[PDB]
Amino acid sequence: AELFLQNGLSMREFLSLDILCKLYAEVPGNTTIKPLLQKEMGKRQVKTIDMDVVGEVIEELMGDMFESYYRKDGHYF
Amino acid sequence: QEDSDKVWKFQRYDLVQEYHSRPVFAPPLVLLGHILIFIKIGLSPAEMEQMDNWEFQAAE
Amino acid sequence: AYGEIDFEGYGGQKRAPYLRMSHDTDANLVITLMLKRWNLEIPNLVISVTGGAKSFVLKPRLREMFRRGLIKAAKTTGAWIITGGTNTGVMKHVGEAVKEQQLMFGSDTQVNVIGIATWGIVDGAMLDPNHSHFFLVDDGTEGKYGVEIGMRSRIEEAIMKVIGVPVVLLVLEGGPNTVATMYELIKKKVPAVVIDGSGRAASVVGFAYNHTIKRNVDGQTINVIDPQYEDEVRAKVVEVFGAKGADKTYSMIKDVLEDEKMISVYSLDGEISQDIDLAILKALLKANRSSPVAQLNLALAWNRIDLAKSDIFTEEQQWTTETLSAAMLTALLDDKAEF
Ligand SMILES: Nc1ncnc2c1ncn2[C@@H]1O[C@H](COP(=O)(O)OP(=O)(O)OC[C@H]2O[C@@H](O)[C@H](O)[C@@H]2O)[C@@H](O)[C@H]1OP(=O)(O)O
Incomplete structure (x- = not known):
């Protein structure tokens, strides 16, 4: 990943919305983030992952009235 | 006790935040201060990008 | 027409003076104009950065290492950066590197960025708003390029006359006028550093330097091309840059290599962790023209202690109190304890 970023690739052109939601989709399973995301998708009854579920996990996982920018910006809807 | 200096430095923030928002008023007259209340900085965008460039090169 | 451009909000409060010139005027008037009438200090170094302007393909790792090393050398030395007056190419990347590395530092952090270009391209190509001085020179109609090369020589x-001041050349990713400036600056006893593994012409100079070394002549034992690999460098100089008229630039790039002490080729993939300022200092200590105190304070500004112990503090050259005095003051005030 480092070699790709320092030879020919920029994150600005690479990453899109679907690549990011797919990137949160194929998390391996031995992590904390897959139980947290599946617990939040169980609280919303949505079978697919989007950035609003990731944003709510980040908001409850930062605390102190943190507001994640996936919920407020139109680029992550 | 092995981190007593650092935990004093950490709770010093909570002391500063406890007394930063108090009324700017006389110590027997702080309720008069609440009467006179009743009656974190933002920067320029080019200045913010210059902040970001200096912070990123110190990170470098 | 001479004066001072205020670029319309292009980054930076300071304005940059410009001067119309012809090639009939001597260079001594230019030097006494830029040291007295424009109030510039006589520097410890003059770096001349040379490359492509329109056709310019560059790697991100290589551009970051080049701009980091060049900024580090020019800000720890306080050197004049002489480039073209073009808002695209290596001049644009040097200007953006100066822009992100002259804002938000100490107040005495300003690099005198001189641009020698032609009046026949300005409004060819507009001026880069990050240069600090402009020499716009012409004699004929628009499209003439060689008068920039002659003035830059x-x-x-x-x-170098006011040697006194060491002048170095940096060449990466250029074209025919780039290697023309290379030849005309080797003619003016300016040593050159060629970034091998960079682009389309600097790779040709590198592949003619280290792959085709040969000493088979009397008359101070010059270097020329190999007869074995002359066909490969002929095909490379006719295919990689320049379509027609490649014979004059092929004989010219053979005549660049006429002195071994004047050309230096520092690659990327050979040494990454070696900074470009050590390459500049090795070129200046290889040319054997600078004063020992100029080599000494260039080694001071770049914290080069091993090359100073090797080639500046040799046996045959004797030091005293007065020659080491200002260097000692610099080493004390900047915390250079090994020096
Ligand atoms: N000084 C210049 N400023 C802006 N453009 C230049 C300049 N010189 C040539 N070109 C153009 O770019 C095309 C090829 O660009 P390069 O080969 O990458 O430029 P080169 O490396 O030969 O010389 C650039 C100059 O800037 C410095 O690196 C050095 O003084 C050197 O004389 C030419 O057909 C020529 O075609 P055109 O002018 O764009 O029609």
Whole structure:
């Protein structure tokens, strides 16, 4: 990943919305983030992952009235 | 006790935040201060990008 | 027409003076104009950065390492950066590197960025708003390029006259006028550093330097091309840059290599962790023209202690109190304890 970023690739052109939601989709399973995301998708009854579920996990996982920018910006809807 | 200096430095923030928002008023007259209340900085965008460039090169 | 451009909000409060010139005027008037009438200090170094302007393909790792090393050398030395006056190419990347590395530092952090270009391209190509001085020179109609090359040769020769001031050349990712400036600056006894593994012409100079070394002549034992690999460098100089008229630039790039002490080729993939300022200092200590105190304080500004112990503090050259005095003051005030 480092070699790709320092030879020919920029994150600005690479990453899109679907690549990011797919990137949160194929998390391996031995992590904390897959139980947290599946617990939040169980609280919303949505079978697919989007950035609003990731944003709510980040908001409850930062605390102190943190507001994640996936919920407020139109680029992550 | 092995981190007593650092935990004093950490709770010093909570002391500063406890007394930063108090009324700017006389110590027997702080309720008069609440009467006179009743009656974190933002920067320029080019200045913010210059902040970001200096912070990123110190990170470098 | 001479004066001072205020670029319309292009980054930076300071304005940049410009001067119309012809090639009939000598360079000594230019030097006494830029040291007295424009109030510039006589520097410890003059770096001349040369490359492509329109056709310019560059790697991100290589551009970051080049701009980091060049900024580090020019800000720890306080050197004049002589480039073209073009808002695209290596001049644009040097200007953006100066822009992100002259904002938000100490107040005494300003690099005198001189641009020697032609009046026949300005409004060819507009001026880069990050340069600090402009020499716009012409004699004929629009499209003439060689008068920039001749002024960049003779003005830096007169810098070397007032040797006194070490002048170095940096070449990466250029075209025919790039290697023309290379030849005309080797003619003016300016040593050159060629970034091998960079682009389309600097790779040709590198592949003619280290792959085709040969000493088979009397008359101070010059270097020329190999007869074995002359066909490969002929195909490379006719295919990689330049379509027609490649014979004059092929004989010219053979005549660049006429002195071994004047050309230096520092690659990327050979040494990454070696900074470009050590390459500049090795070129200046290889040319054997600078004063020992100029080599000494260039080694001071770059914290080069091993090359100073090797080639500046040799046996045959004797030091005293008065020659080491200002260097000692610099080493004390900047915390250079090994020096
Ligand atoms: N000084 C210049 N400023 C802006 N453009 C230049 C300049 N010189 C040539 N070109 C153009 O770019 C095309 C090829 O660009 P390069 O080969 O990458 O430029 P080169 O490396 O030969 O010389 C650039 C100059 O800037 C410095 O690196 C050095 O003084 C050197 O004389 C030419 O057909 C020529 O075609 P055109 O002018 O764009 O029609």
